[PDB]
Write a protein that binds this ligand. Structure first.
Ligand SMILES: *[C@@H]1O[C@H](CO)[C@@H](O[C@@H]2O[C@H](CO)[C@@H](O)[C@H](O)[C@H]2NC(C)=O)[C@H](O)[C@H]1NC(C)=O
Ligand SMILES: *[C@@H]1O[C@H](CO)[C@@H](O)[C@H](O)[C@H]1NC(C)=O
Ligand SMILES: *[C@@H]1O[C@H](CO)[C@@H](O)[C@H](O)[C@H]1NC(C)=O
Ligand SMILES: *[C@@H]1O[C@H](CO)[C@@H](O)[C@H](O)[C@H]1NC(C)=O
Ligand SMILES: *[C@@H]1O[C@H](CO)[C@@H](O)[C@H](O)[C@H]1NC(C)=O
Lengths: 54, 231, 106
């Protein structure tokens, strides 16, 4: 595939076909979002507001 | 010789699934001349006094009225009058009781407060107060528990509803339970229930222990694993 | 540009693998996974059982929630338990409302 095409967020799936499968076909996909991440700014907020999520 | 008609408490409406009206007369001589009929707004009287309980330590007469009426009929606004024909009363009197019209429905926000830090420092007793705020209608019902065991009615004492200063329509109620500071220091959970119309299923509960009522310390062991976790 | 991978509401997590373009030149674009977690700090151990202990430990293995020891009440779901009530000596069961705000009949 082209270098700049992968640079943008276009996902691909390499659908394979094998006999020993439940649905007889396996689909697995990737993209730049699925690649190696660099930064992780986990906020990990700690609040006394407990019951409600967010 | 005083007789008062008791409006139907919601505790009897919900938990017993029935409506009972008690217009009881006390401090009067026993002549068994009471003829109590709960006349409705219409001419028909729904029911008369039943199960008269004169037996009391003071040996004074005590006749209690009853009226099994539909809850929807109560909500319709029909009024019921109790008449007493006892010779002790100079003349018969009718006590009309009606369901209030146009009462707004507002959720009874229940807030449970722990005993003050200074009170625990006294090392003699600790008082836990369950505050019921911003509820309408004024009628409310509160009970107490400890790890699923309801406490005696005497141990917890509740306050009659009073108007909320900021919201005239709303009200507030105040219930206080006292326990030994050792019980509180043990961390035993105390749960307060509020039975009131406005709640979704008419009952809400909140609990508090040593570790959640304005606790001094927050002991957290936050752990994260497999940070990447791609998928 | 955010791709919200997971929004599990028990173990509150908002992993967003948003791509960020690096400066003006691409081909070194950074990918970042923002695991935003809101630990409750006050919810009970067995969150549906108010009388359970307090959560002093919060495991957030991201593998499991990517694909239960529930921590935070979900907005839509109602968590409730039966309660004993006594009025005149009768012990009647009835459902409670641990999250009354989101449990109105709908
Ligand atoms: C403790 O947690 C367990 C799950 O880990 C739950 O127990 C059951 O929850 C279901 C959910 O509606 C109830 O129908 C059952 O009655 C619960 N078990 C029992 C024995 O009552 C629940 O979250 C917690 N248990 C309790 C009793 O609140
Ligand atoms: C992550 O780093 C960026 C700078 O690259 C900064 O602007 C941002 O505030 C950081 N995230 C935090 C502190 O959560
Ligand atoms: C994480 O970093 C990005 C910068 O790319 C920023 O836009 C985002 O707001 C940060 N996360 C939070 C929770 O602020
Ligand atoms: C504080 O936290 C640490 C580790 O999380 C723990 O070992 C220690 O016992 C805690 N102390 C108190 C007083 O909770
Ligand atoms: C505090 O948390 C730590 C780590 O989970 C635990 O080992 C310790 O027993 C806790 N102490 C209290 C008093 O909760």
């Amino acid at each position: 595939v082209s270098e700049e095409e992968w640079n943008t967020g276009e996902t691909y799936t390499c659908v394979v076909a094998h006999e020993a499968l439940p649905n007889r076909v396996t689909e697995r996909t990737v993209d730049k979002s699925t690649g190696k991440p660099t930064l992780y700014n986990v906020s990990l907020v700690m609040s006394d507001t407990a019951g409600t999520c967010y | 010789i005083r007789v008062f008609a008791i409006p139907p408490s919601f505790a009897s409406i919900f938990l017993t699934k029935s409506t009972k009206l008690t217009c009881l007369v006390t401090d009067l001589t026993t002549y068994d001349s009471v003829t109590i009929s709960w006349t409705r707004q219409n001419g028909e009287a729904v029911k008369t006094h039943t199960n008269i309980s004169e037996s009391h330590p003071n040996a004074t007469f005590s006749a209690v009225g009853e009226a099994s009426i539909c809850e929807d009929d109560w909500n319709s606004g029909e009024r019921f009058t109790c008449t007493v024909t006892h010779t002790d009363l100079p003349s018969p009197l009718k006590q009309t009781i009606s369901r209030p019209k146009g009462v707004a429905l507002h959720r009874p926000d229940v807030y449970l407060l722990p005993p003050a830090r200074e009170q625990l420092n006294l090392r003699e007793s600790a008082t836990i107060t369950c505050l019921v705020t911003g509820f309408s209608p004024a009628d409310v019902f509160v009970q107490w528990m400890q790890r699923g065991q309801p406490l005696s009615p005497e141990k917890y004492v509740t306050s009659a509803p009073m108007p909320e200063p900021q919201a005239p329509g709303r009200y507030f109620a105040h219930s206080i339970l006292t326990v030994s500071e050792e019980e509180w220091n043990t961390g035993e959970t105390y749960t307060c229930v509020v039975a009131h119309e406005a709640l979704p299923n008419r009952v809400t509960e909140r609990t508090v222990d040593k570790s959640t009522g304005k606790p001094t310390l927050y002991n957290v062991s936050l752990v994260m694993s497999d940070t990447a976790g791609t998928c | 540009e955010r791709i919200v991978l997971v929004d599990n509401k028990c173990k509150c997590a908002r992993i967003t693998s948003r791509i960020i373009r690096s400066s003006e030149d691409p081909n070194e674009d950074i990918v970042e996974r923002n695991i935003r977690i809101i630990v409750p700090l006050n919810n009970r151990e067995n969150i549906s059982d108010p009388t359970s202990p307090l959560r002093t430990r919060f495991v957030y293995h991201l593998s499991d929630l990517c694909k239960e020891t529930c921590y935070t009440y979900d907005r839509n779901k109602c968590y409730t338990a039966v309660v004993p009530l006594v009025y005149g000596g009768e012990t009647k069961m009835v459902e409670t409302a641990l999250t009354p705000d989101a449990c109105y009949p709908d």
